[PDB]
Design an enzyme around this catalytic site. Structure first.
Site, PDB file in Angstrom:
ATOM      1  N   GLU A  82      65.863  -0.163  -8.602  1.00 21.69           N
ATOM      2  CA  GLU A  82      65.328  -1.456  -9.018  1.00 21.69           C
ATOM      3  C   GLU A  82      64.663  -2.094  -7.802  1.00 21.69           C
ATOM      4  O   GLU A  82      65.334  -2.677  -6.944  1.00 21.69           O
ATOM      5  CB  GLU A  82      66.392  -2.365  -9.615  1.00 21.69           C
ATOM      6  N   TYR A 119      65.874 -12.739 -10.301  1.00 19.56           N
ATOM      7  CA  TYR A 119      66.625 -12.560  -9.062  1.00 19.56           C
ATOM      8  C   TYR A 119      67.874 -11.740  -9.348  1.00 19.56           C
ATOM      9  O   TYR A 119      68.657 -12.072 -10.243  1.00 19.56           O
ATOM     10  CB  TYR A 119      67.003 -13.909  -8.428  1.00 19.56           C
ATOM     11  N   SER A 120      68.059 -10.677  -8.577  1.00 16.39           N
ATOM     12  CA  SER A 120      69.255  -9.860  -8.661  1.00 16.39           C
ATOM     13  C   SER A 120      70.480 -10.699  -8.382  1.00 16.39           C
ATOM     14  O   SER A 120      70.563 -11.360  -7.354  1.00 16.39           O
ATOM     15  CB  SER A 120      69.228  -8.740  -7.639  1.00 16.39           C
ATOM     16  N   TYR A 157      60.973  -4.215  -6.213  1.00 14.83           N
ATOM     17  CA  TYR A 157      60.177  -5.339  -6.684  1.00 14.83           C
ATOM     18  C   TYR A 157      59.235  -5.881  -5.610  1.00 14.83           C
ATOM     19  O   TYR A 157      59.072  -5.295  -4.542  1.00 14.83           O
ATOM     20  CB  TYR A 157      61.104  -6.451  -7.196  1.00 14.83           C
ATOM     21  N   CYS A 189      67.475  -0.571  -3.943  1.00 15.96           N
ATOM     22  CA  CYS A 189      67.126  -1.929  -4.311  1.00 15.96           C
ATOM     23  C   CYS A 189      66.484  -2.637  -3.129  1.00 15.96           C
ATOM     24  O   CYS A 189      66.900  -2.455  -1.978  1.00 15.96           O
ATOM     25  CB  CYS A 189      68.372  -2.690  -4.770  1.00 15.96           C
TER      26      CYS A 189
HETATM   27  C1  LIG Z   1      64.261  -6.940 -11.074  1.00 16.53           C
HETATM   28  C2  LIG Z   1      63.847  -7.953 -10.041  1.00 16.53           C
HETATM   29  C3  LIG Z   1      64.790  -8.437  -9.142  1.00 16.53           C
HETATM   30  C4  LIG Z   1      64.410  -9.281  -8.114  1.00 16.53           C
HETATM   31  C5  LIG Z   1      63.066  -9.668  -7.984  1.00 16.53           C
HETATM   32  C6  LIG Z   1      62.124  -9.192  -8.893  1.00 16.53           C
HETATM   33  C7  LIG Z   1      62.506  -8.339  -9.918  1.00 16.53           C
HETATM   34  C8  LIG Z   1      61.465  -7.771 -10.842  1.00 16.53           C
HETATM   35  N1  LIG Z   1      62.684 -10.474  -6.852  1.00 16.53           N
HETATM   36  C9  LIG Z   1      61.313 -11.030  -6.752  1.00 16.53           C
HETATM   37  C10 LIG Z   1      61.280 -12.435  -7.359  1.00 16.53           C
HETATM   38  O1  LIG Z   1      61.357 -12.398  -8.783  1.00 16.53           O
HETATM   39  C11 LIG Z   1      59.961 -13.140  -6.999  1.00 16.53           C
HETATM   40  O2  LIG Z   1      58.824 -12.330  -7.307  1.00 16.53           O
HETATM   41  C12 LIG Z   1      59.858 -13.560  -5.535  1.00 16.53           C
HETATM   42  O3  LIG Z   1      60.986 -14.374  -5.219  1.00 16.53           O
HETATM   43  C13 LIG Z   1      58.594 -14.362  -5.277  1.00 16.53           C
HETATM   44  O4  LIG Z   1      58.498 -15.432  -6.244  1.00 16.53           O
HETATM   45  P1  LIG Z   1      57.908 -16.887  -5.820  1.00 16.53           P
HETATM   46  O5  LIG Z   1      57.990 -17.715  -7.045  1.00 16.53           O
HETATM   47  O6  LIG Z   1      58.494 -17.413  -4.567  1.00 16.53           O
HETATM   48  O7  LIG Z   1      56.366 -16.534  -5.532  1.00 16.53           O
HETATM   49  P2  LIG Z   1      55.061 -16.791  -6.422  1.00 16.53           P
HETATM   50  O8  LIG Z   1      55.153 -15.947  -7.640  1.00 16.53           O
HETATM   51  O9  LIG Z   1      54.868 -18.253  -6.594  1.00 16.53           O
HETATM   52  O10 LIG Z   1      53.924 -16.163  -5.494  1.00 16.53           O
HETATM   53  C14 LIG Z   1      53.890 -14.720  -5.298  1.00 16.53           C
HETATM   54  C15 LIG Z   1      53.424 -14.400  -3.901  1.00 16.53           C
HETATM   55  O11 LIG Z   1      52.031 -14.767  -3.800  1.00 16.53           O
HETATM   56  C16 LIG Z   1      51.812 -15.544  -2.639  1.00 16.53           C
HETATM   57  N2  LIG Z   1      50.650 -16.407  -2.869  1.00 16.53           N
HETATM   58  C17 LIG Z   1      50.504 -17.434  -3.771  1.00 16.53           C
HETATM   59  N3  LIG Z   1      49.305 -17.973  -3.781  1.00 16.53           N
HETATM   60  C18 LIG Z   1      48.610 -17.251  -2.816  1.00 16.53           C
HETATM   61  C19 LIG Z   1      47.282 -17.323  -2.340  1.00 16.53           C
HETATM   62  N4  LIG Z   1      46.355 -18.082  -2.878  1.00 16.53           N
HETATM   63  N5  LIG Z   1      46.908 -16.473  -1.358  1.00 16.53           N
HETATM   64  C20 LIG Z   1      47.803 -15.599  -0.894  1.00 16.53           C
HETATM   65  N6  LIG Z   1      49.081 -15.429  -1.271  1.00 16.53           N
HETATM   66  C21 LIG Z   1      49.425 -16.287  -2.242  1.00 16.53           C
HETATM   67  C22 LIG Z   1      53.151 -16.218  -2.316  1.00 16.53           C
HETATM   68  O12 LIG Z   1      53.377 -16.446  -0.920  1.00 16.53           O
HETATM   69  C23 LIG Z   1      54.144 -15.121  -2.752  1.00 16.53           C
HETATM   70  O13 LIG Z   1      54.283 -14.252  -1.648  1.00 16.53           O
HETATM   71  C24 LIG Z   1      63.653 -10.809  -5.915  1.00 16.53           C
HETATM   72  N7  LIG Z   1      63.292 -11.570  -4.814  1.00 16.53           N
HETATM   73  C25 LIG Z   1      64.204 -12.035  -3.924  1.00 16.53           C
HETATM   74  O14 LIG Z   1      63.880 -12.614  -2.903  1.00 16.53           O
HETATM   75  N8  LIG Z   1      65.501 -11.700  -4.175  1.00 16.53           N
HETATM   76  C26 LIG Z   1      65.969 -10.871  -5.198  1.00 16.53           C
HETATM   77  O15 LIG Z   1      67.175 -10.626  -5.301  1.00 16.53           O
HETATM   78  C27 LIG Z   1      64.983 -10.436  -6.073  1.00 16.53           C
HETATM   79  N9  LIG Z   1      65.335  -9.641  -7.131  1.00 16.53           N
END
Ligand SMILES: Cc1cc2c(cc1C)N(C[C@H](O)[C@H](O)[C@H](O)COP(=O)(O)OP(=O)(O)OC[C@H]1O[C@@H](n3cnc4c(N)ncnc43)[C@H](O)[C@@H]1O)c1[nH]c(=O)[nH]c(=O)c1N2
Length: 309
Positions: free
Chosen positions: A307, A86-87, A309, A267
């Site tokens: 950045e 998370y950023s 995602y 972003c």
């Molecule tokens: C550099 C960087 C920075 C950030 C982020 C990533 C990266 C690489 N993210 C993304 C964050 O890391 C994360 O990927 C999201 O919050 C989703 O994580 P969860 O654990 O909630 O979903 P999880 O990983 O558990 O699931 C992924 C997705 O799959 C779906 N899913 C699960 N099972 C399923 C099924 N059987 N059928 C269909 N769909 C299904 C879920 O609904 C979700 O949409 C982010 N995010 C954020 O909100 N704020 C931020 O500031 C950032 N910043």
């Protein structure tokens, strides 16, 4: 009117912290607060999470924290869950101005059947719901910090920084802008131009709008702020109002700033990028320029920071 922050020894480090805590031995941090950032018409919840790291997990603006949600890894028995990044949405001093807390800006990932709308807990995003459901005093497993792509270039305190956000992508920019304008940081006195563009679905989906609007009144010669509300606005061509359309409204000013050495940052969700590239290509063509050429130069000059995602 700049806010006193402590401790100023956070300015002493010459390199950003990286991987201070690793997944096998996270830091057990404590939730300070969780609040929704959005109004009733927002299509989903985005939450502001304040986390007490005790000064044990310092970071620089633009970095990310890892969070390990509870439970077993579904893909690996007996193993912890994978880190989600998370950023960080706070400055290094954090929202309590004390160097002990950091904040996250988290969109709650909720599943709906595409046909019936029916939900299913087992298909919700694990870490985003965990965070948005948290309460004061809850414990979280924190890792990192990590990332260098979105560090703020401070060599020129009069640089220009054009910040392009969608949704939660506003997070690093909240931190940049507090450091630039809100906090009393004697060794970084910003005198350039910071220009924030923010695309969200609607008025109720705006994030930190009052804070950004306040900068317009406090620093009218150093801060600009433009919003795109896509479900409530239409572009010149008539396809929902994205942030790219807002950039195009200032095509000439923006291209001039880039040519003058401005940094530009992107972003948010990676789906924001294709439309942005398409708009920039068309703007360049109208000016008689090659966007490919321009982008290659911006990357070579280290002006282009993404950045998503
Ligand atoms: C550099 C960087 C920075 C950030 C982020 C990533 C990266 C690489 N993210 C993304 C964050 O890391 C994360 O990927 C999201 O919050 C989703 O994580 P969860 O654990 O909630 O979903 P999880 O990983 O558990 O699931 C992924 C997705 O799959 C779906 N899913 C699960 N099972 C399923 C099924 N059987 N059928 C269909 N769909 C299904 C879920 O609904 C979700 O949409 C982010 N995010 C954020 O909100 N704020 C931020 O500031 C950032 N910043």
């Amino acid at each position: 009117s700049k806010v006193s922050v402590a401790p100023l020894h956070l300015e002493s480090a010459k390199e950003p912290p990286l991987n201070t805590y690793k997944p096998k031995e996270p830091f057990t941090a404590t939730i300070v607060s969780v609040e929704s950032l959005v109004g009733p018409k927002a299509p989903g919840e985005t939450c502001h999470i304040v986390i007490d790291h005790g000064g044990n997990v310092p970071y620089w603006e633009g970095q990310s924290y890892g969070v390990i949600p509870p439970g077993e890894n579904p893909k690996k028995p007996g193993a912890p869950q994978n880190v989600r990044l998370y950023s960080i949405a706070s400055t290094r001093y954090g929202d309590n101005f004390d160097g002990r807390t950091g904040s996250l800006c988290v969109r709650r990932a909720v599943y709906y059947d595409p046909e019936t709308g029916k939900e299913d807990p087992s298909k919700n995003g694990v870490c985003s719901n965990f965070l948005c459901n948290s309460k004061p005093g809850d414990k979280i497993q924190l890792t990192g910090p990590s990332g260098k792509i979105m560090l703020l270039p401070e060599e020129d305190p009069n640089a220009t920084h054009i910040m392009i956000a969608t949704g939660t992508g506003v997070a690093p920019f909240r931190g940049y802008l507090r450091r630039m304008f809100m906090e009393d940081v004697p060794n970084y006195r910003f005198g350039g131009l910071a220009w924030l563009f923010l695309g969200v679905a609607n008025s109720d989906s705006l994030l930190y709008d009052e804070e950004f609007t306040s900068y317009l009144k406090q620093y009218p010669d150093n801060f600009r702020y433009d919003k795109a509300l896509s479900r409530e606005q239409k572009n010149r061509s008539g396809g929902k109002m994205y942030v790219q359309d807002k950039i195009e409204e200032y095509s000439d000013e923006i291209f001039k700033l880039l040519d003058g050495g401005a940094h530009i940052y992107f972003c948010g969700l990676k789906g924001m990028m294709p439309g942005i590239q398409d708009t920039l290509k068309k703007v360049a063509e109208r000016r008689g320029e090659s966007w490919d050429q321009k982008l290659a130069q911006l990357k070579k000059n280290k002006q282009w920071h993404v950045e998503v995602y």
